[PDB]
Design a protein around this ligand. Structure first.
Ligand code: NI
Ligand code: NI
Lengths: 177, 177
């Protein structure tokens, strides 16, 4: 199955799953975020080849479906397979409000699991170090910069080129507070 | 500067320009189409390296901005440069107002110009050979299939792997009518 057909399947599923959803505080669709995370992942493969690239790209597109949508793990396993479902679960803090995992346990499990899932989190965090919403106070931007530093420390092992990019984005983000 | 930074600048620009625009008879944002076309372009590079990949990826994201949005050639030239502006113009049948070019002239100009612009048109047509919209009759699906065969004939020289993928998509599409 062609890489672009893997993307399309996950992309249409995500566009449906996130249909009511914007970027926080923006009229723009949440799909804007997912497009950037998937692109970072496919660009990462050019600077260090990824095993199971097609499934990893689907995980990049689908990584918010269990947290933010009516999507179930059984739906992901049946349509995309165990490796994709497990990736989305690994990247989910909470499956809706429910029993939220702490950042320590969440990053540890990503560090000890398949490297492709940790790489998707690196790409997600690179995407989230765009300039912050105008609404964010100094303390909120500082907190986010700090949590970014922990993500690089705990998950940067997963892909050297992507870790270098995330380090550069973290250094850049400092100017915003 | 990084391929993902090129994508992000064009992607945010396109999300805003196309903000009040949907897919054909679907409530999903038009951005769903642009994500697939840009992903096809980046995937094509893995099967045959593209000169000026970053700018070509921006053209893939921006290719409908002059036809469908308030965007001016001036804004594209100032923000993305002449090569991107010229690509979007090459891929525009009409720039908002001004006469519509006929397909013969449009395809000839893409065939005789920069191959990267022709490659973006191959990726667009690949994307458009998903199952047809549920409101198209047999004659319309047949007409679209026929136009697709003309695009492969006139533009397939631009990238051998992508022409092979378009031929496969054209063969698959016959099933829908
Ligand atoms: Ni995310
Ligand atoms: Ni298009």
């Amino acid at each position: 199955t062609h890489l672009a057909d893997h993307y399309n399947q996950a992309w249409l599923f995500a566009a449906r799953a996130h249909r009511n959803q914007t970027l926080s505080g923006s009229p723009l669709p949440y799909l804007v975020h997912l497009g950037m995370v998937a692109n970072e992942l496919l660009a990462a493969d050019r600077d260090g080849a990824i095993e199971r690239l097609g499934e990893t790209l689907q995980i990049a597109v689908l990584h918010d479906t269990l947290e933010d949508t009516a999507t179930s793990p059984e739906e992901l396993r049946q349509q995309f397979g165990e490796f994709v479902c497990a990736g989305v679960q690994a990247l989910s803090k909470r499956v809706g409000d429910g029993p939220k995992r702490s950042l320590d346990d969440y990053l540890q499990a990503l560090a000890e699991g398949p490297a492709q899932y940790a790489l998707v989190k690196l790409c997600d965090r690179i995407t989230n170090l765009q300039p912050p919403p105008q609404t964010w106070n100094q303390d909120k931007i500082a907190n986010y910069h700090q949590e970014s530093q922990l993500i690089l420390a705990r998950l940067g092992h997963a892909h050297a080129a992507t870790a270098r990019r995330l380090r550069e984005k973290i250094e850049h983000y400092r100017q915003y507070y």
